[PDB]
Amino acid sequence: WRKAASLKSNYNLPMHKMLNTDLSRILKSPEIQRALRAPRKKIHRRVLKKNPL
Amino acid sequence: VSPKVRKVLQLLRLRQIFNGTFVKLNKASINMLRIVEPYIAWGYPNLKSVNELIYKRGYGKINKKRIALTDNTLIARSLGKYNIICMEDLIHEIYTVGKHFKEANNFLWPFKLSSPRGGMKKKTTHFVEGGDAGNREDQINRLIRRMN
Amino acid sequence: PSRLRKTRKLRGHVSHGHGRIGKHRKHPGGRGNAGGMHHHRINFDKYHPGYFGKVGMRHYHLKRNQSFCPTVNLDKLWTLVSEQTRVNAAKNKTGAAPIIDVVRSGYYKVLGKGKLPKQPVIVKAKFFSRRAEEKIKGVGGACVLVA
Amino acid sequence: SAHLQWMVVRNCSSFLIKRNKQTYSTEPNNLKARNSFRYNGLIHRKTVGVEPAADGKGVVVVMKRRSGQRKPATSYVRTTINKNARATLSSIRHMIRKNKYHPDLRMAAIRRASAILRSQKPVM
Amino acid sequence: WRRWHRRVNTTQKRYAICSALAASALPALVMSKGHRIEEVPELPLVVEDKVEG
Amino acid sequence: GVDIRHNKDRKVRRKEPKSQDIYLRLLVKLYRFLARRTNSTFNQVVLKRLFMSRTNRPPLSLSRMIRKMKLPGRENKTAVVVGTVTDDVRVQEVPKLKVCALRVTSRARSRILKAGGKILTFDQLALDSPKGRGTVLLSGPRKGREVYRHFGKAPGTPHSHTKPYVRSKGRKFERARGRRASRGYKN
Amino acid sequence: ACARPLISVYSEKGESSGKNVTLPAVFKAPIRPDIVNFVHTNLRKNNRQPYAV
Amino acid sequence: AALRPLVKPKIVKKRTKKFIRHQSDRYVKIKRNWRKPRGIDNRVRRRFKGQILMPNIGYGSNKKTKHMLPSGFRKFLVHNVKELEVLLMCNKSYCAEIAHNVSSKNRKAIVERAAQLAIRVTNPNARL
RNA sequence: CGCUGGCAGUCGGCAGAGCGAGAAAGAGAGUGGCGCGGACGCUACGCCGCGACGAGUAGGAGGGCCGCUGCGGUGAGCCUUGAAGCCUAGGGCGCGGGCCCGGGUGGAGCCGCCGCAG
RNA sequence: AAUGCGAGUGCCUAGUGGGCCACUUUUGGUAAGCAGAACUGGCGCUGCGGGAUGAACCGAACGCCGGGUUAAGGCGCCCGA
RNA sequence: CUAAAUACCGGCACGAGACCGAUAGUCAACAAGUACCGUAAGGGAAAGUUGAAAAGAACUUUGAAGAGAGAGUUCAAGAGGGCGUGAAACCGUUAAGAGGUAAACGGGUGGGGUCCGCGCAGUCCGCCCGGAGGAUUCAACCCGGCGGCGCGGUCCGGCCGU
Numbered sequence A: 001w002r003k004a005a006s007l008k009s010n011y012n013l014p015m016h017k018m019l020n021t022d023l024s025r026i027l028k029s030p031e032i033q034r035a036l037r038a039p040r041k042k043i044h045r046r047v048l049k050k051n052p053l
Numbered sequence B: 001v002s003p004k005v006r007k008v009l010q011l012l013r014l015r016q017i018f019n020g021t022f023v024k025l026n027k028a029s030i031n032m033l034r035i036v037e038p039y040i041a042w043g044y045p046n047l048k049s050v051n052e053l054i055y056k057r058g059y060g061k062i063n064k065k066r067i068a069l070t071d072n073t074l075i076a077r078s079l080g081k082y083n084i085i086c087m088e089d090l091i092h093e094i095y096t097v098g099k100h101f102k103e104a105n106n107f108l109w110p111f112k113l114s115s116p117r118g119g120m121k122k123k124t125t126h127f128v129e130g131g132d133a134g135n136r137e138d139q140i141n142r143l144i145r146r147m148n
Numbered sequence C: 001p002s003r004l005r006k007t008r009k010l011r012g013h014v015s016h017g018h019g020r021i022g023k024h025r026k027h028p029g030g031r032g033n034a035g036g037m038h039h040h041r042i043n044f045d046k047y048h049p050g051y052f053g054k055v056g057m058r059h060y061h062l063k064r065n066q067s068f069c070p071t072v073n074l075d076k077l078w079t080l081v082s083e084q085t086r087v088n089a090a091k092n093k094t095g096a097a098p099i100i101d102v103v104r105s106g107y108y109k110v111l112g113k114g115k116l117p118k119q120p121v122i123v124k125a126k127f128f129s130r131r132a133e134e135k136i137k138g139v140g141g142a143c144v145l146v147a
Numbered sequence D: 001s002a003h004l005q006w007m008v009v010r011n012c013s014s015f016l017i018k019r020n021k022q023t024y025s026t027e028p029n030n031l032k033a034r035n036s037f038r039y040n041g042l043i044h045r046k047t048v049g050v051e052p053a054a055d056g057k058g059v060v061v062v063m064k065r066r067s068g069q070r071k072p073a074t075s076y077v078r079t080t081i082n083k084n085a086r087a088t089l090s091s092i093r094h095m096i097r098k099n100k101y102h103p104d105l106r107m108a109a110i111r112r113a114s115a116i117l118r119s120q121k122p123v124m
Numbered sequence E: 001w002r003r004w005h006r007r008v009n010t011t012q013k014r015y016a017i018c019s020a021l022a023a024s025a026l027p028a029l030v031m032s033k034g035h036r037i038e039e040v041p042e043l044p045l046v047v048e049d050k051v052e053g
Numbered sequence F: 001g002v003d004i005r006h007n008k009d010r011k012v013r014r015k016e017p018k019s020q021d022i023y024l025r026l027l028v029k030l031y032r033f034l035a036r037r038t039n040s041t042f043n044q045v046v047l048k049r050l051f052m053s054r055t056n057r058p059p060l061s062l063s064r065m066i067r068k069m070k071l072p073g074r075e076n077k078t079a080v081v082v083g084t085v086t087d088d089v090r091v092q093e094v095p096k097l098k099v100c101a102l103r104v105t106s107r108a109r110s111r112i113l114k115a116g117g118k119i120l121t122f123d124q125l126a127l128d129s130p131k132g133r134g135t136v137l138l139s140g141p142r143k144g145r146e147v148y149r150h151f152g153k154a155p156g157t158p159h160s161h162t163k164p165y166v167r168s169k170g171r172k173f174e175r176a177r178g179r180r181a182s183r184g185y186k187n
Numbered sequence G: 001a002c003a004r005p006l007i008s009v010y011s012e013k014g015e016s017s018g019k020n021v022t023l024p025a026v027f028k029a030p031i032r033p034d035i036v037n038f039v040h041t042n043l044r045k046n047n048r049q050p051y052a053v
Numbered sequence H: 001a002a003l004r005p006l007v008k009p010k011i012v013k014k015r016t017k018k019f020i021r022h023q024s025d026r027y028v029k030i031k032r033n034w035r036k037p038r039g040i041d042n043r044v045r046r047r048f049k050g051q052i053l054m055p056n057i058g059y060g061s062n063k064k065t066k067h068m069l070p071s072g073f074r075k076f077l078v079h080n081v082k083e084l085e086v087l088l089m090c091n092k093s094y095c096a097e098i099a100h101n102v103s104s105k106n107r108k109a110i111v112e113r114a115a116q117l118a119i120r121v122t123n124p125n126a127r128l
Numbered sequence I: 001c002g003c004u005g006g007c008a009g010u011c012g013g014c015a016g017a018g019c020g021a022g023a024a025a026g027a028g029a030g031u032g033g034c035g036c037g038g039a040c041g042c043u044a045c046g047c048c049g050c051g052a053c054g055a056g057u058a059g060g061a062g063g064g065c066c067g068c069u070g071c072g073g074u075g076a077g078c079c080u081u082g083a084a085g086c087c088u089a090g091g092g093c094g095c096g097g098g099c100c101c102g103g104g105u106g107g108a109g110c111c112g113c114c115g116c117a118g
Numbered sequence J: 001a002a003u004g005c006g007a008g009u010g011c012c013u014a015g016u017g018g019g020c021c022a023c024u025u026u027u028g029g030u031a032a033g034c035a036g037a038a039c040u041g042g043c044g045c046u047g048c049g050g051g052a053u054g055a056a057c058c059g060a061a062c063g064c065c066g067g068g069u070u071a072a073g074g075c076g077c078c079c080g081a
Numbered sequence K: 001c002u003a004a005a006u007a008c009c010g011g012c013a014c015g016a017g018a019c020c021g022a023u024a025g026u027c028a029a030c031a032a033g034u035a036c037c038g039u040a041a042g043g044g045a046a047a048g049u050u051g052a053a054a055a056g057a058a059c060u061u062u063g064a065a066g067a068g069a070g071a072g073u074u075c076a077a078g079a080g081g082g083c084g085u086g087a088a089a090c091c092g093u094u095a096a097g098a099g100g101u102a103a104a105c106g107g108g109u110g111g112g113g114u115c116c117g118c119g120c121a122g123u124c125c126g127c128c129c130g131g132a133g134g135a136u137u138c139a140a141c142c143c144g145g146c147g148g149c150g151c152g153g154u155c156c157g158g159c160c161g162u
């Protein structure tokens, strides 16, 4: 990525769109984890409407 | 259905047959109920009629979703800024037309009522012609118990 | 890929996407540019204004090579020479001005559109425009004509 | 990375079977044998495999060491557990929990190890 | 005179060469091609120059 | 039944990128997690712009980047680009710039790194500022494409400067009847 | 990434020799199976022979 | 000694008859396989009373009991012995059908392995 | 169809198990007065939860683990201990296009998955 | 002011360009299941309950089902009441 | 006057194919520009497959014979000289059911059949308790091997750094 191809005229290695691709280690990093809200993992299913009358 | 009448029936939120809604009355409301007069049957509800309607068919419009009013938190989360925090506050603001009647009435979903038990008299004619359409003043409660 | 085309989803539908009343006939309005005056006049006037008629003088044996005059603006004037040509004059103290030959880079006329950096130039060109030479004189420079 | 090569192998792998509205994987270290990111036995740096022994009895537990990742000859360590049905279930659970080695596969390893021991019993 | 042949940009051909070469040094990607390389000592398998002889 | 109209029930908008490239699809996973797990609206805009087509993320010129980061108040900030940062060669001085983009061209990268700034990717931006704080979102000119000169009111209509579709331009290519007061009329 | 390891050159007998070559930067290029498929299925049409009735 | 599934819920099917093609009874050239009628005057696609019904989406089976055999299992097609170690961890919800082109010699070995792996075979006495 | 809804928190003896609640924001840090144990999950193109809705000619769009033929890869795929094809008051799956098994007939080739092409 | 509803905007674009019927208004004609208009709703494109039958009338519009209740119509027998 | 680079669905000799597979592909896979038609110019088909090997059914018997019945060949005549596989339309016979609003159909049941469940004493799984048994057996220690982790706050040595 710093030295061009010598047997080709003008070719370089292509650039990376995403350097660190291990998004598991990206996501469970303390930099990201502190700037998150609490997870809402409680399932609230529908309530059978009883007649109050 | 005529287009002018379709627009008023949508502004009254009556998009389906046997739907019911609470409307406060003034000149601007009577002149719209006159336009939709042969297609509706309106009247003056009792306090027990409001109690039956809000307790049995009361659904709230919360995040554009028809949510059953099974707990007072559901009312208090949306109408709590107008000091309406329970079923009793909702019934009070509906029955006595208060300051936040527009918000309290628009929070309620339009009432999805059944077919009238016993039967209709005549759908196509006015109430004073021995039918059903138009203004039945004290007799909307008799339809409310058989339709609710 | 014929498997991605519309024809494979049109098997079973009788008119093949072309209508029951107005069928897919062969040429129901003429062939090609037919009826530009008569029955496609609204399209030809609403989308192709000026299509009918004669404008201007004729030139019989026109060869494009005589009027060859490629142009470069002054905002591209410093891209024709190398970067160490430009920065050496910036670090230079004797006031020597680099020479840009635009005919060598393949341009004949210099037009003046963009800015010039505050440093002297000697631009050799076949043609110059007025604002191009005044933007070179204002930054301090020479406009040398070549043939 | 594991996610990066999962995005390659999620649909065009040679271990993938897609028939009868189900999907699986014939991968060597895929315990539960299903095609998923968590259970894939070759994209991860730490994998656990539970297989039957070469002879009739025993359960072979295979891990992947962290050092040789591009070196598949010496990458996997293998142990043979020819014991009773309960101490192997304590042993594999210890090997995962105490070593903290890919801890979300412990009950899957125990459920595979129970099935191998059930399969090595005499049939009725 | 159907268009039998397609032309591909040289930079994309080289890019595909780089993507195919970089995928051949990864374990899971060559396993998922089905090659039996469980006992291969190193995945960039490099040998000496007397093999050409 | 109800008398509602189902014409506009399905909104057309993008839920996912149409592209199948797996490096973009991992950044989509990252910012999809971030947009729902943070209350920052920056991650929502970045995630929505990652879905978009190539014409909906036009490239920025370096000169437009210099002028949009030269504004007062926005010093020492990260310019965030969803499209491509291309070089603009009609500018001589490049100050240092902290850059986050999907793509940076090879000659713009050299000029930025020679100026002394940094070029990040979007995973690096997610690690640095997870909520995108101290950032300036930028986008290219969307009407910069040549396709938009042929759009609008039709040519051959009064007060419509719309470019027509011609096979070539010249003296005798649509310049006579709808264009001259001499020949016919002029709109 | 950027970390280029040191691959070992193996002898013809299968054991490692003393020679080590650093990993070329080609093997850290991005993996794009969509572009590899696009290049392959367009360049594979170029060896075809015409057929006609 | 039958192999029970994990659960056996009650299977509700909204329709058990096939959806036969319109006028597949007056002709042999018209097969039983369903074709949606698209005629201008067709009394079947206009949903006239007392005619052949059309396969709408409302007839769709419950997703919990969809593709499930009356024994309570779902089915997987198996060609060789190696495809059973695929199914051993999906044991109490998916069962095996040996494919028709598998010979009897290998079909004996498949059901022999399925017996010790406790995988149910829908056709264990198939060829012999 | 919408909520451009929720889940990377499976954070475990380097542990402390939560974000449904009417009321913008932190179960924050410091500074002074025995028993070795804990179901499932997550093909994130996946899984899950709330509501509302469902006519259709001409026509348009999307999804097909619907179907036919051939090619590049791939199933240490199937096969004279019986392939393709055909027949069947047999057992089934799928809303459907269709498909898988059982029996018979037959005697030599055939299919699944990822892409490509007509 | 009341009531109600998330809106705004840009490309590309098929089919169609024979229509017909009804309350009211209305032209020509003795009149027409005639010819020609305005408004709205239908049929065409649409099944269902009723008018015995039935393009348009009355009611009501349609995913697959169970329970309950109705509309317009009916309740001697056909034929539910 | 003048070579070369350029053209080539005819001819001779070749090679190949993401082409077609006997209603396809040339009209023509075969005694095909043949049989046949038209005075003529011209028009112009249909038509592949026993078996591995003819081993192509000797002999007995009825009939004038075509045809059968035995016998025999073959892995197989359920391959018998237009013979591989042998569908549908149509027909013969057997078996079952039915029958005065032409037949057929959709929904809902009922009856009779044909087969299937290889049904006909009815599911196992985990823990605990009790009772009869059997092992070369548990924990804890010792030795050796392997693996994981190490903020070994900062142990020694290497490798890499868009």
Ligand SMILES: [Mg+2]
Residues within 6 Å of the ligand: B118
């Ligand atoms: Mg009653």
Ligand SMILES: [Mg+2]
Residues within 6 Å of the ligand: none
């Ligand atoms: Mg009326």
Ligand SMILES: [Mg+2]
Residues within 6 Å of the ligand: C013
């Ligand atoms: Mg259509």
Ligand SMILES: [Mg+2]
Residues within 6 Å of the ligand: C014, C015, C019, C020, C023
């Ligand atoms: Mg037609």
Ligand SMILES: [Mg+2]
Residues within 6 Å of the ligand: C017, C018, J014
């Ligand atoms: Mg069309």
Ligand SMILES: [Mg+2]
Residues within 6 Å of the ligand: C022, C023, C028
């Ligand atoms: Mg037309």
Ligand SMILES: [Mg+2]
Residues within 6 Å of the ligand: C024, C025, C026
């Ligand atoms: Mg056309």
Ligand SMILES: [Mg+2]
Residues within 6 Å of the ligand: C038
């Ligand atoms: Mg004219």
Ligand SMILES: [Mg+2]
Residues within 6 Å of the ligand: F001
């Ligand atoms: Mg509906």
Ligand SMILES: [Mg+2]
Residues within 6 Å of the ligand: F006
């Ligand atoms: Mg619709």
Ligand SMILES: [Mg+2]
Residues within 6 Å of the ligand: F006, F007, F008
């Ligand atoms: Mg729409």
Ligand SMILES: [Mg+2]
Residues within 6 Å of the ligand: H040, H041
């Ligand atoms: Mg019609």
Ligand SMILES: [Mg+2]
Residues within 6 Å of the ligand: none
């Ligand atoms: Mg529909």
Ligand SMILES: [Mg+2]
Residues within 6 Å of the ligand: none
């Ligand atoms: Mg049959």
Ligand SMILES: [Mg+2]
Residues within 6 Å of the ligand: C021, C022, J018
């Ligand atoms: Mg017409």
Ligand SMILES: [Mg+2]
Residues within 6 Å of the ligand: none
């Ligand atoms: Mg008329």
